[PDB]
Amino acid sequence: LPFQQFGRDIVDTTDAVRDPQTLEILDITPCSFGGVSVITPGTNTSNQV
Amino acid sequence: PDPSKPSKRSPIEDLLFNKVTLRDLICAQKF
């Protein structure tokens, strides 16, 4: 709606902002991340992973 | 098991599966 700039999600996090010059919807999504797991045999068998 | 069903589940097993079920909340946690 007019006079409505920011935005929030269910958990109260800034997910959208409005550009000052040219008003527009600007979603904010964090870049990808995650865990890393290493699969290895015994170090006395080989060294490949 | 019922061959016609693609998931290969007995007729009783289908009823159980379709009865518990469970920006959206799931994506909020992941971030």
Closest chain A CA to residue B28: A11
Q: Do B23 and A30 lie within an 8 Å CB cutoff?
A: no
Chain B residues with CB-CB distance to A13 below 8 A: 28, 31
The Cα-based distances of B13 to A36, B8, B22 in angstroms read: 36, 10, 17
Q: Which of A10, A15, A30 sits opposite B25 (nearest CB)?
A: A10
CA distance B11 to B17: 10
- The dihedral of CA B11, B16, B18, B19: what is its sign? positive
Q: State the structure-solving technique.
A: cryo-EM
Q: Is A18 helix (H, G, I), strand (E, B) or coil?
A: strand
